[PDB]
């Protein structure tokens, strides 16, 4: 009977896990090689990519974490008896 | 199945590899195997481990 | 009490150390140095054997390899936690315990 | 380009490979599995 | 600071080898040496970090 | 601090299993009636088992 006038606070918590963005129309996963990496816009020319991120503050120094997830493959052939040579592509971000 | 499916004769089924060589730094160290997989035989990376 | 002779609650299974096979009391079994010990299965040794020791306890490699390739014939290409549907009640692996 | 050379599209694992060690692989599957040391590309 | 400190004695390789038949695995290590048959693996994460 | 000098002790446990140990050439399961049943080595003859 004597409860005081309040206010709501609302949050959520999410650990183990990486925010995804897919680089796709729809955002959904219809393949590794998704639709918009095989477009021809950014198939032939190049482009200048710049992001910028709103986060709420600490105390301390933090680090902000980006993973461009791109194909990483090995290709390892072995001719003879004893001699193994590989190739490796990364693409993009190539070295 | 009775044949072609595993050899009959003597082979070892693990191998035990001693360095050839060990370096030593203040952090860290560094050691050197020579693996020689055997004629009629196939190794599976896998399997290995230190 | 409970009869594992009968309903299968068995408990002793860590009081082996060697099994050795022969035919014809002359030839041994597998042979063809198979295994480390060309000559028995060595169940477990104590401290003094502890270059064949696995998974931080005192059974060998061989033995442990034996008993997964019996189970769930895993191996020869890694070993790694065999499915939950394949690892049943009485398996194995599932009641395998490292103490120290 | 070199895409198909790194198996990022085209054919699959079972195209690419010599007939014989196809029919090898399958032939052992539960003895020596092969099919994991193989790309198979999966374009949208 | 707190003292712990950490030695490594003796390191050795292992590696267990499928007892396959001689005829069967030249046969395989002989049709794995061709191009076309070449060994191809991809990192499951395979990203690029800053 | 006043730690004393110690040894370790290392056993396991396994219970409700049975040890096994399958009479074929490389310890697999690839059937009911193993390759070595039907190698004619035990097919023929007797032996005496200790």
Not at chain 1, 31 to 42: M, P, S, V, W
Not at chain 3, 33 to 41: G, Q, S, Y
Not at chain 3, 83 to 94: A, G, L, T
Not at chain 4, 30 to 37: A, D, E, G, P, V
Request: glycine fraction near 4%; hydrophobic fraction near 40%.
């Amino acid at each position: 009977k004597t409860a005081v006038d309040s206010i709501t606070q609302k949050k959520f918590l999410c650990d183990r896990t990486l925010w995804r963005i897919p680089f796709s129309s729809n955002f959904m996963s219809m393949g590794a090689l998704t639709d918009l990496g095989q477009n021809l816009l950014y198939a032939n020319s190049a482009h200048a990519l710049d992001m910028t991120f709103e986060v709420d503050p600490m105390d301390e120094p933090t680090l902000l974490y980006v993973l461009f997830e791109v194909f990483d493959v090995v290709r390892v052939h072995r001719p003879h008896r004893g001699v193994i040579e590989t190739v490796y592509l990364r693409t993009p971000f190539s070295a | 199945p009775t044949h072609d499916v595993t050899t009959d004769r003597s082979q070892r089924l693990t191998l035990r590899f001693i360095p050839v060589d060990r370096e030593d730094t203040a952090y860290s160290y560094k050691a050197r195997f020579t693996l020689a997989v055997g004629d009629n035989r196939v190794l599976d990376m896998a399997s290995t481990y230190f | 009490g409970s009869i594992p002779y009968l309903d299968g609650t068995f408990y002793l299974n860590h009081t082996f150390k060697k099994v050795a096979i022969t035919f014809d009391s002359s030839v041994s079994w597998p042979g063809n140095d198979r295994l480390l010990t060309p000559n028995e299965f060595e169940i477990k040794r104590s401290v003094d054997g502890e270059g064949y020791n696995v998974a931080q306890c005192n059974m060998t490699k061989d033995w442990f390899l034996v008993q997964m390739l019996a189970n769930y014939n895993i191996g020869y290409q890694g070993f790694y936690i065999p499915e939950s549907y394949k690892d049943r009640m009485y398996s194995f692996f599932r009641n395998f315990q490292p103490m120290s | 380009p070199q895409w198909s050379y790194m198996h990022i599209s085209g054919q699959d694992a079972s195209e690419y490979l010599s007939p014989g060690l196809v029919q090898f692989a399958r032939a052992t599957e539960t003895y020596f599995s092969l099919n994991n040391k193989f790309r198979n590309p999966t374009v949208a | 600071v707190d003292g712990a400190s950490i030695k490594f004695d003796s390191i050795c390789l292992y590696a267990t080898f499928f007892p396959m038949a001689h005829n069967t695995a030249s046969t395989l290590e002989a049709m794995l040496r061709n191009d076309t048959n070449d060994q191809s693996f991809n990192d499951y994460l395979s990203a690029a970090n800053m």
